[PDB]
Symmetry: D3
Subunit: 231 residues, 6 copies
């Protein structure tokens, strides 16, 4: 277990996956009862606690498919995780989305070579577990949250060579851009476990709008509640 | 239009899309009030009638993304269609599925070059309209139907060069194989309309089991009922 | 057998392959002696009759490589067809060609993934049977018909995303666009049978010119005579 | 001009294109009247003479699409060549072919990236000029030469990494392997000039059979006569 | 400067890039004079100090091309870094390498889509700055260190689907596998700055050998000295 | 061998590889003691003589990866060659380089399909033998020659379809264009022998400047001297 050093049993079957290990710290201290730090390797904090009687873990994943994939592989294969929910921010690429909107990723497009290699150029659609997608949606609805369910783009490239790199994706209905969901969805299917990616729109890549630190924390807190209730 | 010769007005905004024109005839005659044929070009029957007082059309699409894409394009761009539901059969590629199960396609993988060409080799995930997916799922649940929501593979190739062509897809959670869903989902996104593909398992490609003519009809009718209630 | 329901000797070894089943009907009724229907599945009419004492069949194929491929596979593999001649219309992409010109496809370019998958990205040239090409050419010549022998492009996509999709093809000598020849030529080679695709220019995609219905019929009949004399 | 140093009228509009400059010498000295050398750059001999009162040139090309392409480009673009006939040897990849058979390449498959780059991964079929194909065929026929008209594969790679590199090509009807035809047919189309590739089977890549030097000469001379009578 | 929050001027023009932020901490505390922490965002520690009078920074990069690329982009474009040396461990894929050997990456092969996308399928070779490569080699030589200069493979995938994934790379002379160098080398060229990747063999992927914690620290310390002397 | 007809023993282990057989003749006659021709097949001159009492061969390769690859394969596999140094000219694609500069190819980018085919679309970086690279660099330095070590592009295509084909390569640091280095470097790795490609800038593809015949000779001779001292 090279990247997570914890005894077997230290990680719950249900796990939240923020990217930032400090966001994992924040979640554990604010949302979990009796949180226990089980991982410090590479400063990639992982905690285990309880939420309304359910055992839940929260583990930083790092940025991009290659990093997140290492943690996901180890969590599933070595620690026996079964329900993986990524919680994150994303940049909106259509004006149909507003700042602070919640996006639940039905599928994840990608520019990564991950599946081009696996399927020899054929097209595999990495998808959310429908049961999780459905219940997360119901949770957001019951809170009156602006929520969209649809496509995201998982990019390898935060900083593209050219401007307006997402125009074509938007024309084909893609809602927002992040960097990991395609990897999570593909690995979940590979191992036959369940996964979901939930996102809050922190930036609007079309209007140039940005969320204030107060706005971020408020909608972030709500997202975490949704994930914890779903899981 | 070149392939549908009816005037604007003859075709309803909500449309069922079977592949076989004789299935279009069947659906129209058995499930719609006052069905009237609007198209005979290439024997590709299209009908319009009413369901619970609202107009619904039913149009044969032919087999494969290239044929279906012609009809879908014309229906949306020339006939103003807004809600497009494919109903069809599919071959199960996993033992998790049984004959007569309903599959609702959350997304559609493909071996077609359609999106490889459009996205210069990057990976686009053709997806269902979530609202239609959700409503169809709830419809199937309310009837106690065995139903799965997940991936299907839209193939160009009914007869593959080698045996076991679908095993890698199945290993990554793909439920069933058909030939059009990826086209429907991509074009719906292209035009900003709604789409869904619902399928009944008529053939099991792992077990070799096959439904009787009597069995086919019974579950097909049920699928049509689900589709009409989803509009 | 799944898409053609006829007994094993119902189809002749020589077969004309229009796309539109209503054109198959027309050909049977007007050019064959004792035409008898052998298929009605999916309204995809097929007939067998005689021409100058020899059995000939005529079978609708539907549009695009995926559809046509299903029929061609079944015809060759189950029904023992040996000589397959596609007769169709095409759109000219060069002003070197005029409306009503006959084009005999020496080979067929494609945007389909069928051979990219088969040959792992290498380039396979789907070609006509030379003997049939030569015989058809001599037939057109003997009638003083304006005829060209060269490349066609078989596209998956009747409706392209952007304007002027065929310019580069034309710069490299491609004469006209249709949707099936590449599939026909590839499968004929796969099974070691003989094939040819003959086309009438019905639309000029550069000049926007279109043939009248009377013009379509006169040249179409001529093409059919050429095809029948070639088999 | 950088690879052929001759004045602008030194080269004839009709040109034979063997690969080996020493074969160009042989052809000039044995089949042409008043042969005169016009090129010595890189030892890539080119000659102009007459055949039955009409000027004909013969120019060495070197091996492979990159080399041959340099000569073909310069010949067409700087020297005004219009009719280019490659005469060469090839390896048969099907037992349907025998040593000493003549193959006239109707088209040329390739593993070169030349058209994958040009057509962004779509498939272009490089083809012979039909008029030249037909005339050469009639010439071979008139001499009772065993002749086949069909596909060849132009490879970048004389020495493949693994055994049996050509099996799949042969399964799809490809007759023989050489290294230039695809480049010749593509550039002839690029510039709107006429081209043909004629080949003698010198080696059988299936049976391991090889022609004796005496056999090579007799059939080679025959091929040259056919080429000269075709231009 | 989203991922590194430091004032401009806080980062030296010369920077070491370990992957693990705790390795950056180790380097700063053991090799640098007056080390100052300038970054804590995402626990991705970055320090600035001096080495033998030279101002040097050390910054954690995270794992994989997507993560490392974010930091590299920001360091170069926002902080003005000019000399970037990645120091890391790698797994050897040839028995010509021994545990504890030093590898200096002359170039970096990859399975990432980074350059396939940029160059539209053409092949770009990401390379080290020769001056750095040369001087690092001279530094290792003067210490009598077992050192190899050549290819590495930068993979997206720590955990491959199949076993023996590196056999073909090894057959073409590739020395070792890591996850970032191709990204570093490509970005360095993109921005016209200088880069190098130096690696110690911590694991042997062929023999299954592994380094002891004492062995790792000893050869690691040596590598850091080499990098600091080179920079 | 098929393309080099000399016995084993005639060819030395160290070999210079110009492209032009007349350059091979030049090198042999002007730089070697007792040069003796060993090959005349296809006018592709090869010589063996001595340099400072050790045998050195010189062999023409032709133009492009397919031709050069034939000779390289035969030299290594049949003639036992162990050290292969290409000497040639190249076109500069950056203003950083001046006419008459020496370029030593650290690696070779390519548009050839050679490695795309071998590595199923992943990216292999063809590299020089570092020891030869280092020694050649030191040789050039000792003579005060303007020398650069870095990337070159090996193209299949001397005459591109559109203007400015090399600008993207230049933006990513590529120094100069030639047609063979990528082949030489890949095959050397394939066979586990040494290789290096040294080039003089004879043409500037940005400025359009060109060296005089007198200039070419002077810097060419110097390059040969460097090459012979590198053995
Ligand atoms: Mg209702
Ligand atoms: Mg010496």
């Amino acid at each position: 277990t090279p990247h997570i050093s914890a005894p077997p049993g230290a990680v719950a079957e249900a796990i939240l996956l923020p990217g930032d290990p400090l966001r994992a710290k924040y979640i554990a201290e604010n949302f979990l009862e009796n949180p226990v730090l089980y991982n410090q390797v590479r400063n990639m904090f992982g905690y285990t606690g309880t939420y309304k009687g359910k055992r839940v873990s929260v583990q930083g994943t790092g940025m991009g498919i290659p990093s997140a994939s290492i943690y996901i592989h180890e969590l599933v294969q070595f620690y026996g995780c079964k329900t993986l929910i990524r919680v994150g921010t994303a940049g909106a690429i259509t004006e149909r989305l507003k700042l602070r909107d919640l996006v639940i990723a039905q599928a994840a497009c990608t520019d990564s070579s991950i599946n081009n290699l696996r399927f020899a150029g054929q097209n595999y659609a990495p998808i959310a577990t429908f049961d999780l997608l459905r219940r997360a949606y119901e949770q957001a609805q019951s809170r009156g949250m602006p929520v969209h369910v649809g496509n995201v783009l998982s990019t390898d490239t935060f900083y593209h060579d050219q401007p307006n790199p997402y125009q074509l994706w938007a024309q084909f209905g893609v809602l927002a851009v992040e960097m990991e969901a395609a990897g999570l969805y593909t690995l979940a299917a590979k191992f036959g476990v369940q996964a979901l990616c939930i996102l809050t729109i922190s930036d609007h890549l079309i209007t140039g709008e940005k969320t204030t630190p107060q706005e971020r924390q408020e909608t972030f807190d709500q997202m975490i509640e949704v994930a914890l209730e779903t899981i």
